Design a protein around this ligand. Sequence first.
Ligand code: GDG
Ligand code: GDG
Ligand code: GDG
Ligand code: GDG
Ligand code: MN
Ligand code: MN
Ligand code: MN
Ligand code: MN
Lengths: 375, 375, 375, 375
Amino acid sequence: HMSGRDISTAVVVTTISDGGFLDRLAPALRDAGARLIVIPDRNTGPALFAACERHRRLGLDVVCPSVAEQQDLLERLAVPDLIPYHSDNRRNVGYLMAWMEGFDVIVSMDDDNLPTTDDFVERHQVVCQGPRTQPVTASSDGWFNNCALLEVEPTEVFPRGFPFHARPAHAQARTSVCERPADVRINAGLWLGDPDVDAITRLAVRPNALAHSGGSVVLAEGTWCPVNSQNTAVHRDALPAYYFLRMGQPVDGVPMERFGDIFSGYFVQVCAQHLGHAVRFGDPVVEHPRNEHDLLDDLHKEVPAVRLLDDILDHLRDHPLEGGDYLETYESLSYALQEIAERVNGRAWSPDARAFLHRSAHLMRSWTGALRTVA
Amino acid sequence: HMSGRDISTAVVVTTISDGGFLDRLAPALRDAGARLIVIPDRNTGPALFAACERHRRLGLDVVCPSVAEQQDLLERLAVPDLIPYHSDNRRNVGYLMAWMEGFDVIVSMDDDNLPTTDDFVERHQVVCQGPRTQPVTASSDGWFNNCALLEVEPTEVFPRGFPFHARPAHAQARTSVCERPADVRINAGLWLGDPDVDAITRLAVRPNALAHSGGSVVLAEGTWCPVNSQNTAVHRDALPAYYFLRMGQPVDGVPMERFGDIFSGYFVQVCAQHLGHAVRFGDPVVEHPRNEHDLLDDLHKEVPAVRLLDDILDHLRDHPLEGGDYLETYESLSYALQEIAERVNGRAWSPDARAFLHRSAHLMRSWTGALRTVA
Amino acid sequence: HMSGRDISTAVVVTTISDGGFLDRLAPALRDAGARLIVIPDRNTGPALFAACERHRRLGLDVVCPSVAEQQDLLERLAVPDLIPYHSDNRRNVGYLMAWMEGFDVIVSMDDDNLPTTDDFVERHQVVCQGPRTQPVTASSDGWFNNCALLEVEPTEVFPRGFPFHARPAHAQARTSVCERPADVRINAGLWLGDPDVDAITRLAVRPNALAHSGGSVVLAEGTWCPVNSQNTAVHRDALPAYYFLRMGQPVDGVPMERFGDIFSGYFVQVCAQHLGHAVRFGDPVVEHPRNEHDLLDDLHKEVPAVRLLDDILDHLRDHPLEGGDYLETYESLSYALQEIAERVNGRAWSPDARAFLHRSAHLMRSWTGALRTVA
Amino acid sequence: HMSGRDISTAVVVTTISDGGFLDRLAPALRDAGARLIVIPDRNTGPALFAACERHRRLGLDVVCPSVAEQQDLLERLAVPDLIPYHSDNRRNVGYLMAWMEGFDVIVSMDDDNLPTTDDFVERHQVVCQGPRTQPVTASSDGWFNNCALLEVEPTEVFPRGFPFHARPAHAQARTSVCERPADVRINAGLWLGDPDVDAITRLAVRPNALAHSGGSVVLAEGTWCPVNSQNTAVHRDALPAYYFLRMGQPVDGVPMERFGDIFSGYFVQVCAQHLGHAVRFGDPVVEHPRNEHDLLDDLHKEVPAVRLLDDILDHLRDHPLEGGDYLETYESLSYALQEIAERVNGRAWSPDARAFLHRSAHLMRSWTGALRTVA
Ligand SMILES: Nc1nc(=O)c2ncn([C@@H]3O[C@H](COP(=O)(O)OP(=O)(O)O[C@H]4O[C@H](CO)[C@@H](O)[C@H](O)[C@H]4O)[C@@H](O)[C@H]3O)c2[nH]1
Ligand SMILES: Nc1nc(=O)c2ncn([C@@H]3O[C@H](COP(=O)(O)OP(=O)(O)O[C@H]4O[C@H](CO)[C@@H](O)[C@H](O)[C@H]4O)[C@@H](O)[C@H]3O)c2[nH]1
Ligand SMILES: Nc1nc(=O)c2ncn([C@@H]3O[C@H](COP(=O)(O)OP(=O)(O)O[C@H]4O[C@H](CO)[C@@H](O)[C@H](O)[C@H]4O)[C@@H](O)[C@H]3O)c2[nH]1
Ligand SMILES: Nc1nc(=O)c2ncn([C@@H]3O[C@H](COP(=O)(O)OP(=O)(O)O[C@H]4O[C@H](CO)[C@@H](O)[C@H](O)[C@H]4O)[C@@H](O)[C@H]3O)c2[nH]1
Ligand SMILES: [Mn+2]
Ligand SMILES: [Mn+2]
Ligand SMILES: [Mn+2]
Ligand SMILES: [Mn+2]
């Protein structure tokens, strides 16, 4: 008479579209009874609110808090300046809302990611499995390429946020699997169509993801892979470390963008491994008919971040973190970044580059303080 | 009679000159038995070291630590990256050394400031008299113009770092003096010749300080005036809050300079008033035959900081500080600056302008951490 | 008696105001039968058009071409991109129109400059008297300070655009007057209230022009003074060289502004002296109750141009110009600026500072090309 | 008795190496009797001069003019500021020197391009063949990918400077060959090993050129392909249009670099087609064991240029050029770029981007004026 199993899932999507994406996203979420938290912005038209109510009458537990309601909640948490407007950083509101409402699983998605299977929510519930002995995947160079789990034309690619200095030698890395205890708390689902690559790779080969052929893997301690926020489930205990980093900080006078989830993906990952938890890559797989972007503009935004990421990732392996839970571990991580900001050296490490990590660390602790205020 | 009160004074000068300035600076120092700490840089010629040895044999207690000895000291204190080279920020090394060696008074000077009286060191010892009921000067607008204590041609001027928003209405402010308890811990001596004005004032009216006619004043709580580092005595208790702020941070892509002591002067002043201590302005007066500068280059370096100073000072009046001594109060101030960085608004507050306060706050706490590590 | 000399005057003002300034500007204009050309912008409210119609019925020959009519005119002249919107550069449209319509005198004014005498237009007609032996003023340093013709408190000031390298030694310069032939083609009227000083001078001493006490002067060949566009009459022959320089060019990454007329004033002045013509300073004097400005923002906009002006003016004294009229001489000047851009050296002459002169020269010739296309 | 055929060839290489590359470059040039003009810089060590003299005694007609000799020649041509130091732009000295000395063929190379066949110079003499009916290659989209003539792993690549907006649709372009009159004046030889790709492609797939399998092609009028300066022969008549563009101009405050020959390659190509001449791609093929570069630094330098190149190439097809030879056609091209600078629109077209084309056009005409002075 095994009963009592009931995992709650909330899907977080921020968007400025008219809401037409709900026609293909609602069926998977409606069949599973999950909640969808749509976060609009000041540049979001009134057609999105009309689409949420239309799908709410069809059985979808969808909410769409207006910017006034969002700002009131942030005001009451003493963080009115934390989350800016006209930015997809406002998905942090949905993360916080789902965390306050006690959901077990928080699935971050974008408005151009459509589930391909009916068990989309169920597959993301893997972050609630708990610790068990299971096949974990280790890599001799400390990196795993989740795009090697996909059939990609015209050539092999690496995901967005993968360090560039490790790519040429990655072909000689030794991949091994063995039975070990692991506790999956983050599940990064893969994507067909336009894979999550950086603008450099997209401008070079225009990749196309044909099929998910590699299955799913759980990464052992010491093996990393970037985690995005377009098809990623985070267990509610790990959510405090999943704050979407604020963009716009200049590197050599060039404002960075498009890497908010590259940092959050690595940050929640180094926090999970310090607490004995793991990151999973594989199913559920979505289609990514990506919104229309100017690739040269995407390149101009990503370069300031890619100029620093390899150094930051290298120094993060040197810093030991402290903390008993994800709140304390994330705060310890924020102070680790401030020490890294002054020790790292290179041509790209101008005074505004070093100060980027200092303001990021403050906003990280402003985010955890808001969660502590909610208690 | 009274005996046993042996007040120790250490003068701190950082320079890239050939040491010729020692000829006019040493007599007042060696006659008082004061120590002179000369901090050279990588761009400092070998003639300075020869001049320190020539004036040492004449009876001056002068020390001139090489950059290797400086870096060895800073590395042992776990701050090898705190103080940059090719910068007058290296005077922080002299601040640190004078504090380690237990000096009562630390006098910050530049290599073009020359004492005018034989009691130069004695007058600066006023930061050691302790609390006493004394005439304190208050101003209705909360600001005091120390250049009003001087006879200046061709017109009235304000000191460098004086907020611009308060200058037009300062003529209507009411100045009052009354007997109140005060504990002087900072004594900003005045300057004849080229007064300490900003590049705006120097380019506009080219002022010349003729004489010191206003005497000396002690500013009551709530009355502020910028404090520079070219003729300023700081009691050793207040020394932890007198860290010379690191420049080079861009504001809208323009690196700031020449305001490192404007911030230190206001920071030690806010910390002192929180602890019930006061700032004094007046004697001892020095001659300032200012080193040759490109005034348009000084303006280009000062404008980035000028654009933010009025806002920073306004928010500092609304942030009360915590702490029982200068170390705790300075750290409390550093955290207050990070809150101010996210609350302040204005066209000049770009993401790099806000990150300037965040990196500065970390550097302030890196400074206090080295001070704790010493003791 | 003498008859047949019908001098036509057109006043040119560009504005984003509501037109209330017309109440004090129209009387002197309509009493003299002068035309007022008001150039609105995209950011100009609809109240200006209603004010032009209200003052037209009172007898003022005022025209206010819509942005559509402006762009239609500029497109037909093959310069649709020459004059930007949301900028006071649009006064060039008024310059062009007044020149097409055959006016003898073009008076450039701002919407906060108000005549003080009934003979405002008559005094500006001095640019039409022709050559005659008259008292011309020469200065030993090659510069004249027109603000010395005014009673200014609290101290002596220089006009906006006056080179800084020459200010300290200008007090020692010898001013001489003697009878020489001169042909006045530019008449820069002076201003009471807020004088036309740079943001450096305004922030430093906040000057107030009390009265016009020095009379009027005509500057001999080799003696220069900046000429602004807020109360300046230009003879139609000299109008082709009075193009208002387009701002927005970065200098070390900082866009310049507020100096468009500093360049036009010096350019029309160098071209006039090459053709044997002269610049006059003095009456008619206007009141300048200056529109409200953020003075620190004015400083941020002016510094990029201030950093280059002294060098540009120095090289202009060593480049002789060719041409028989203002069109040919202005084009010769534009090519001279391109040679200067590659010869000048200095810390402020970054590749974008040099390219500023190259794009400006093309725009100057784009302007003269439209002038040739008109005629 | 067919005699009298004797084509002269000069190879131009600028380098800061110690001269060891001469051991593998001299045999091909010595066997053909060609001249090698090595252009050193101020950051070039004395070991290069010792290597040129060592190879000169072995039979190589190699010259290495010191920076004093280079600057004296430039001084006598009234272009002392045209060519900067610490830059590979100094290859323009070698272009000019070979042109003054009357060589028929000028082969631009870098110090890391080694010939693979003995007929290296002979194959480059094709630019002296003269007009004849020959197979010309046309493309329906107006672009040709010379990297498709090579066997490249791991996937197909495009050359550096190839427009990005045309790459996805290039696979559907129709390539056709037919007998037509053509006059080859530029021969772009291909490269094995590290192909001449942009940093985007190199950071994405790390290409490797295995073999030259496509043969050689001559491009018809209307079909373009970028031409670099690492293995390219230019007939002396076309050399005036082959000026290596000066880099360092900021685009949105980011200085461009590494595209000096991308512009010169397209510029000499549009000039050749207007004069009825053609560009050849294929043999002779060199090995490119490229010097060690930081690819992320290469990316940071190339992005400012790639942000504008697609627009510039599009507008160059709209502008008809004038001129009877390459000097007049290049000068007409320079004026065409100035008109393009004001008509083009886009986010990347900041004021400093538009001014880049204006200063480039001046330097282009400064280069032709120097060649006209040589006459
Ligand atoms: N509030 C708000 N304001 C905007 O001005 C605003 N403007 C767009 N958005 C929303 O942000 C989401 C992401 O946009 P895209 O999917 O179109 O762009 P991608 O390059 O595919 O996303 C990449 O970067 C993302 C984060 O940087 C990762 O999550 C992805 O994994 C990764 O592929 C969309 O839903 C969109 O509708 C706004 N939301
Ligand atoms: N280590 C090092 N490296 C350098 O590259 C380096 N370069 C110069 N220096 C030293 O810094 C001191 C100050 O220089 P100046 O007196 O010439 O400039 P001022 O405008 O007169 O000083 C103003 O600003 C100062 C702070 O910026 C305040 O202290 C003064 O109150 C205020 O008047 C001198 O001794 C000089 O020799 C270096 N020292
Ligand atoms: N088209 C348009 N668009 C705007 O966005 C736009 N915004 C303002 N304006 C108009 O430009 C005129 C000048 O503005 P201000 O008088 O307020 O500023 P000042 O500092 O006093 O003027 C100084 O600089 C001027 C040149 O920069 C010289 O002429 C003067 O000699 C000199 O004193 C006014 O009429 C105003 O209404 C616009 N016009
Ligand atoms: N005078 C001088 N001063 C320097 O400071 C200086 N520093 C280097 N050099 C010389 O310039 C040549 C090119 O350098 P690399 O071959 O190492 O770099 P690449 O990325 O392979 O070259 C790419 O860009 C070039 C032009 O931008 C094209 O020609 C090539 O086709 C294309 O592949 C070399 O010989 C080198 O030794 C200097 N020369
Ligand atoms: Mn997407
Ligand atoms: Mn000084
Ligand atoms: Mn005005
Ligand atoms: Mn190379």
